[PDB]
Scaffold this active site. Structure first.
Site, short mmCIF file in Angstrom:
data_model
loop_
_atom_site.label_atom_id
_atom_site.label_comp_id
_atom_site.label_asym_id
_atom_site.label_seq_id
_atom_site.Cartn_x
_atom_site.Cartn_y
_atom_site.Cartn_z
N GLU A 14 -0.59 -0.63 -4.58
CA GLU A 14 -1.49 0.51 -4.70
C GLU A 14 -0.61 1.74 -4.77
OE1 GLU A 14 -2.08 2.90 -1.79
OE2 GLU A 14 -2.67 4.20 -3.46
N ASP A 19 0.83 -1.20 0.00
CA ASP A 19 0.00 0.00 0.00
C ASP A 19 0.87 1.25 0.00
OD1 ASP A 19 0.06 -1.63 2.66
OD2 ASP A 19 0.20 0.47 3.28
#
Lengths: 309, 599, 603
Positions: C339, C297
């Site tokens: 991400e 992330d």
């Protein structure tokens, strides 16, 4: 000695329903007791690594009711043994009918199974299950049985079945996921032919080696109980296996099979039916039913081919 | 200019050890380059489909040192080709000595074997294994060799062998479970007669077609390496095959031949530099292009003599000198059936320069002793005990090869005396002693089950015997012995220092007690060579305290009676065998006990 | 020595990708081996019940550059232990960075977390799944992921999460019934603050105690694998939790932190030791826990930092590149997802083409655009048509996973259901359409817990999902719609290929009625998607098609089984050999209100 006067009295009556307490191989820290029933034998001896497999080292003594007994110092758990029975002119090596475990010394897929001195000690933790377990009252409770062949169910590797322990957690997990109340296991008693599925039994008092030791099976049942699953055993009193060292012609004569030549002929099995007339056969068989419910905490017994009986 | 002038200068020297880079057939996308050595030729021509097999289409040009070369456009990989050499009045078609692959045009090797243009491009994935190979350092590490003939090992169906690739996973699977350290492959070089087992060689630079393409073999070795297994290739520099189109009378006269009683006129002329290039380059060829870890030379005595052949002796010395220079971690093993000294010794000490020698003396004594009945072994005790006088003369490998299980000599099983139990017991005892005896271990396939029949190459091994108890037990015993070998370093050092006698004078009871040592570690070996259990048998030991039973041949799991000490053996401080402490043990029938101090 | 000279050589090189094999606490039958990385330490000692917490009982000995190693007899599995590191005048107690299990001594995590001596022995039964998993090949296969917070999903009792074991069977049954291929787990690594959701990590090598023993998590993953489901773990290489006890200032000075002046909690990718521990943790989860995937992330926070004057943190970019390279080398069938909320090119690209080396990248652009489009009211959707159509332009720059996640259903952003405009029927219709277009749109699929039934409430980690909503028909219909979507996804390969190959536009110019038609095709097979983004039903709407003949209605969002009006085309539509939308034939269809129609030629 090994056999009290009450023990011989009950065996003659056909009332010795705990006979495993005295028959088979019973280990002591110094040595093992051996007791085998062979009324028409002129001589019986225990053979094992513990005496250089010499038949004359330890000849069991004839007690009453055709019962033989003897103690062997140095016979220890895990030692392999065999009975050498002499019927007049002929002698033969035979397995223990009351064997508590049998094992192939060979490790081979096709092999003789050898009786092994065994200790059945095990501490159970299935308290809650057995105190709340309900038998005959289950008539008014839901009973959903998942029938199982342990070797066939799941494989740990190709051609390799799960242990009694190794299967425990996977089988209990699966049955709970599908909501069955009991598992019925195809005969786990020692059987020579894996292809028989267990219906040809040699060691009625011994769990099959293929899935582990006795304590592994006791553990499996224990585990299943804690998980809330019942264990029903398939039991085969109708006929015994045809293996030459097994129950066939044990003392050199008919013993477990009908003495009469005519009423031996049987369509389903023949020659290998139990002679229910004999108190000794009744002892051996009825004790075995209680043996599994007692020593293995089994919830149920299912008898097949009753019409043949 | 196909050939460097250095190449021609190196060829005349006999120093061209990469000669395969230029000699033979080398493919290019447009065409193939051809290079053959034929000094007594008036002309040499390439014949093939690429010119209607016409001898005047592509005549190679003669370069220096009888090296002929030429380019053929359209000569392609997988095509069969041939050399036509003219010696004055007569001309003849010959095969390529440097051929990298051969195949039978008829379909039968015995009729025709044809050189085929080949590319050796192969991407290896065995990086990890070769950065760690040992060899010369393996003198102090366990080397347990599984000797194999690929065609005879396993069959897909009766009379149909496994491909090089198809064999990989089964042999690697089997060798790992066994615990074997290497596979020694009976000669893979192209040979016309399958019944030769490969020792009559035609294509020294070509792996045999029977099992696949050359890359198929490289994949097999590549695969085994990833699985951590070594590959030894049997090699035959002593003699070449008697095939008219082969090496015999190549340029129309003697060329590879001398210008031996075993193979007269098929012996390599080690005098000629051209012969020396061909042979030593080929040795390196296998270590280079096929990543082979070791090479085994058979019948070395046939080269040494004819009295000594110094041509050959300098050749062997230079062979070993060259190998370890280009491949410092290779292994060369020699079988020499005379008492020639310093086979395993370095050339700089007047040795032949080998790393290992087959202990054929040991094998003969050992087999002769165990062919004998235990009742009679009493009278032959010295044959058993005396193996240790000659056990450190060289860096040795204990050997039980295919040569011992052929020609009516009988399987190892067949050789052992008595009924089946004693036969199985004797073989389990034999291997136990062989694993204890100083030296590395070699066992030919099928010995691990103790198979009944002699090695028959025209069939597959009797794997069905692995179902029966006695043979499955011996396979278990060899696996377990191999576990003990790798786990304990006391067996890694085959030096005189490694071995100490405990007792050798029990001739009546036919027992041997000995110690195998490295520093801290000791391994005690007690051997009962008679079917009589021995009780209260005391064996002296250096250390007191608790001793463990690490292995017992007589365990019922191996097919044994099961008499045992089963561990928990405590030393008693009473002098036995001139030693401070003694063990009071039970000696099982025809069995070996292996014991170490508890830690 | 506990440490080989090769072991120290690779730690200095940053090539010790097995460092979990040697660093941390390693049980032995009489004692535990202890190994710590502490380069600027003057002394290091192991403290525990096994020595009455004596600092001089077992001082560690430096075995190499910055490594301390020592053996403690009597330290056994299950004992709590501690490192005492001395920086000159000052010493401090620290946790094991390589701890394989941690437990709170107080009973509450936020007051304290302590290292536990652990044995990681586990017997697996997932061999069959391991060989089966595609990995890189998954790009051509259906990848549907259910995102999960294990504590938040279901509670056995109010406020009590399911154990690793207790969750296994309910989650497995749940995931199969709805047809998802993998479960993506929010970071399970040991973390002090539950409210962090696991993203502030203290124990990278320890699964969180909240759900049980390490072997319990191993059992869960094993269980899911036997059931044919993959597990993707969320991994946080960007930053570390702020614990006085853990990681920060390990030696009393900067160690995992940058020496140069989530600032100060960021990993120093310059240090060979830092990459060693980080890349070993990546391999650790794939090795000891058979994890199928890792999702990283906030990748952009790694890539940038805010003569040289460069905002790109080049340290991190090489760490990411060498991270991805190492995983696929040791695990050729793993999956790595990132991400990254910047338009950093080639996140999903191979390192040898100058990519970051991930297999998948979150299509957050798509998520933003799609969601922004669907909150607008259908009356206004006319005016924002380009936001729907434009998503395809960028739909192929990366291998992408369409993503709906916790991030979008929290912090006043509202439930997915809450996001959709209109009354309850329309909200269910809008959500059914969103998922319909999302499954039809190119790219793999990810949906977070509760979105599958259209939960009212925002995702609360202190609460369990509103499973009671499954009694309401619309919520059950949305769950069935998603179930049916995954079944079509798993079966029709036209949806497996998310390349420009697999997508063809049928029509994008109906702005007034806000309708879009597109095609999905692998080889011969094709799937037709017609989308009505307005509650007004469309009658005799013609849509051009390539093939003529009978066409089948494979799925109708508006079917009553999903809670819809039931308007539809009754199974068979016949194609008319009349040109439409530049196509040879056309189907004249009825478009239900706020509904997606999936149609197949008949085979």
């Amino acid at each position: 000695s090994w056999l009290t006067e009450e023990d011989i009295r009950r065996w003659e009556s056909g009332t010795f329903y705990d006979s495993y307490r005295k028959l088979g191989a019973h280990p002591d820290e110094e040595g093992t007791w051996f007791c085998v029933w062979a009324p028409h034998a002129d001589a019986v001896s225990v053979l094992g690594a513990f005496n250089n497999w010499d038949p004359e080292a330890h000849q069991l003594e004839r007690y009453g009711a055709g019962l033989w007994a003897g103690y062997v110092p140095g016979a220890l758990p895990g030692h392999a043994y065999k009975y050498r029975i002499r019927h007049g002119f002929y002698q033969a090596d035979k397995t223990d009918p009351y064997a508590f475990a049998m094992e192939p010394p060979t490790g081979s897929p096709i092999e003789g199974l050898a009786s092994i001195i065994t200790r059945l000690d095990y501490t159970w933790h299935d308290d809650a299950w057995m105190q709340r377990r309900k038998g005959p009252a289950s008539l008014y409770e839901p009973v959903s049985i998942y029938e199982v062949h342990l070797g066939s169910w799941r494989h740990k590797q190709p051609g390799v079945s799960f242990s009694y322990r190794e299967i425990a957690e996977p089988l209990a997990d699966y049955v709970q996921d599908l909501g069955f109340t009991h598992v019925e296991l195809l005969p786990i008693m020692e059987h020579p032919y894996y292809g028989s599925w267990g219906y040809q039994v040699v060691g009625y008092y011994a769990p099959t080696f293929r899935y582990g030791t006795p304590q592994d099976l006791m553990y499996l049942i224990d585990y299943l109980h804690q998980r809330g699953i019942g264990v029903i055993l398939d039991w085969v009193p109708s006929h015994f296996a045809a293996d030459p060292q097994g129950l066939v012609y044990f003392d050199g004569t008919t013993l477990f099979e009908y003495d009469d030549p005519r009423m031996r002929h049987h369509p389903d099995w023949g020659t290998y039916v139990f002679d229910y007339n004999k108190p000794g056969v009744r002892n051996f068989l009825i004790s075995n039913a209680l043996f599994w419910l007692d020593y293995y905490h089994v919830d149920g017994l299912r008898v097949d081919a009753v019409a043949s009986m | 200019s196909w050939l460097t002038e250095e190449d021609i200068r190196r060829w005349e020297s006999g120093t061209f050890y990469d000669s395969y880079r230029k000699l033979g057939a080398h493919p290019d996308e447009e065409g193939t380059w051809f290079c053959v050595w034929a000094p007594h030729a008036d002309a040499v021509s390439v014949l093939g489909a690429f010119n209607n097999w016409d001898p005047e289409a592509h005549q190679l040009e003669r370069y220096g040192a009888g090296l002929w070369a030429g380019y053929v456009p359209g000569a392609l990989p997988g095509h069969a080709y041939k050399y036509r050499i003219r010696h004055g009045f007569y001309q003849a078609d010959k095969t390529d000595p440097y051929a990298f692959a051969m195949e039978p045009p008829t379909g039968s090797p015995i009729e025709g074997l044809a050189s085929i243009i080949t590319r050796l491009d192969y991407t290896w994935h065995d990086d990890a294994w070769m950065q760690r190979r040992k060899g010369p350092a393996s003198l102090y590490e366990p080397v347990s060799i599984y000797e194999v003939h690929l065609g005879s090992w396993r069959h897909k169906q009766p009379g149909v062998s496994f491909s090089y690739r198809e064999i990989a996973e089964p042999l690697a699977d089997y060798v790992q479970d066994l615990g074997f350290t290497h596979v020694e492959l009976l000669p893979i070089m192209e040979h016309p007669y399958y019944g030769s087992w490969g020792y009559q060689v035609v294509g020294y630079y070509a792996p045999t077609f029977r099992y696949g393409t050359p890359q198929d073999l490289m994949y097999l070795i590549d695969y085994l390496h990833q699985r951590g297994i070594g590959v030894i290739l049997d090699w035959v520099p002593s003699h070449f095959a008697a095939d008219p189109q082969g090496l015999v009378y190549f340029d129309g006269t003697t060329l590879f031949e001398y210008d031996h009683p075993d193979w007269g006129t098929y012996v390599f002329d080690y005098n000629k530099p051209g012969v020396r290039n061909f042979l030593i380059s080929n040795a390196l060829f296998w270590l280079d292009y096929y990543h082979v870890d070791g090479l085994r030379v058979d019948a070395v005595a046939s080269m040494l003599y004819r009295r000594e052949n110094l041509e050959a002796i300098d050749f062997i010395k230079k062979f070993n000198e060259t190998v370890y220079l280009h491949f410092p971690e290779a292994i060369t093993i020699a079988e020499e059936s005379t008492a020639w000294p310093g086979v395993s010794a370095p050339t700089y000490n007047n040795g032949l320069g080998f790393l290992y020698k087959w202990n054929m003396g040991w094998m003969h004594d050992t087999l002769d002793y165990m062919r004998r009945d235990p009742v009679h072994r009493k009278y032959h005790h010295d044959t058993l005990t005396f193996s240790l006088w000659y056990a450190f003369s060289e860096h040795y490998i204990l050997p039980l090869s295919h040569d011992e299980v052929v020609h009516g000599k009988g399987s190892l099983w067949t050789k052992m005396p008595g009924d089946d139990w004693q036969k199985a017991a004797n073989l389990r005892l034999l291997y136990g002693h062989m694993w204890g005896h100083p030296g590395k271990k070699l066992l030919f396939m099928g010995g691990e089950f103790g198979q009944h029949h002699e090695w028959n190459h025209d069939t597959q091994l009797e794997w069905h015997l692995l179902d029966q108890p006695y043979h499955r037990g011996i396979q278990a015993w060899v696996r377990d012995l191999n576990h003990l070998y790798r786990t304990h370093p006391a067996l890694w050092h085959d030096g005189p220092e490694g071995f100490e006698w405990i007792d050798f004078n029990d001739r009546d009871q036919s027992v041997i007690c000995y110690l195998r040592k490295h520093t801290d570690r000791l391994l005690l070996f007690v051997l009962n060579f008679t079917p009589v259990p021995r009780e209260h048998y005391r064996v002296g030991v250096p250390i007191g305290g608790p001793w463990r039973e690490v292995l017992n041949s007589d365990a019922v799991a191996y097919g044994g009676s099961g008499m045992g000490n089963f561990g928990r053996v405590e030393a008693v401080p009473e002098s036995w065998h001139g030693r401070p402490f003694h063990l009071e043990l039970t000696l099982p029938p025809l069995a070996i006990l292996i014991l170490e101090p508890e830690s």
